[PDB]
């Protein structure tokens, strides 16, 4: 996260770290959506152009974390993966359309002050909150600058951007399964996701029911916190039929 701040303790209890077993390193972010299901970006797990193709046994899910590198004894919980499910129409060839994946844990994780699931939006949730100028929150242990790494989880709040502005900022083909967020140069304020943050959540707190909803997944950006560029997020509500289908069929 560039131009963010240290998270408070228990501020994002759905935050998940995807951790590579060897070498031991941060792979991506992710989020907890139930006691057995974790949501992330498909490209964190599968990206053929760079010969990225993880299997269940290659990584671990670390939940309840705050410090990036420390083993947080008695606080974090480390979980093994039973199965990975990538969206069947994930477009890794072109623009990362439908950049979403689920992973089922071998065993249910116990909820605590530090570990708790985020809500997923329904149609009216999305219609009411996914509006230009409304702010969401992005969190992660990614880099602090495009060109180092944080001691603890970082947080930044960023406004949703108008669709024509998103489209005009990039040469990538943008689809309805994406939305962009970030400040414009004239707005002065800064902030963005960066390397290591992909797969993590873009959340919003409904003013109607005072619950946190995961509206986006950190998907891609052209550099980090560049003027005139914006971060792109998977639109979780638009892919929720797929999410439900997978959880309903595989538990």
């Amino acid at each position: 996260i560039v131009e963010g701040s240290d998270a408070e303790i228990g501020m994002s209890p759905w935050q998940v770290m995807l951790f590579r077993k060897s070498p031991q390193e941060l792979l991506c972010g992710a989020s907890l959506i139930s006691d057995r299901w974790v949501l992330t970006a498909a490209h964190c797990l599968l990206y053929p152009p760079w010969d990225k193709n993880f299997t269940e046994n290659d990584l671990l899910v670390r939940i309840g974390k705050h410090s990036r590198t420390r083993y947080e004894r008695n606080i974090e919980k480390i979980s093994m993966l039973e199965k990975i499910y990538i969206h069947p129409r994930y477009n890794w060839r072109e623009n990362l359309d439908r950049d979403i994946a689920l992973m089922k844990l071998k065993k249910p994780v116990a909820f605590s002050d530090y570990i708790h699931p985020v809500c997923l939006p329904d149609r009216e949730t999305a219609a009411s909150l996914l509006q230009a100028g409304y702010k969401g929150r992005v969190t992660g242990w990614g880099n602090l600058k495009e060109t180092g790494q944080p001691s603890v989880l970082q947080v930044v709040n960023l406004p949703i951007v108008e669709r024509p502005v998103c489209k005009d900022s990039t040469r990538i083909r943008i689809t309805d399964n994406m939305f962009c967020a970030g400040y414009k140069p004239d707005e002065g304020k800064r902030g963005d996701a960066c390397e290591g943050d992909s797969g993590g959540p873009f959340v919003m707190k409904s003013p109607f029911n005072n619950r946190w909803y995961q509206m986006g997944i950190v998907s891609w950006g052209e550099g980090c916190d560049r003027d005139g560029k914006y971060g792109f997020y998977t639109h979780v509500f638009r892919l929720k039929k797929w999410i439900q289908k997978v959880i309903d069929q595989f538990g």
């Binding site: 909820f111 708790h116 409304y134 709040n157």
Partner: peptide, 28 residues
């Protein structure tokens, strides 16, 4: 989950984090 977006250290005990108000103020 019935509970779940309600954080144990914030919503569950009626405490607000340091920047959630920034989000609320953007929701017009």
């Amino acid at each position: 989950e019935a509970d779940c977006g309600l954080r144990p250290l914030f919503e569950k005990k009626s405490l607000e984090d340091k920047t959630e108000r920034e989000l609320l103020e953007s929701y017009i």
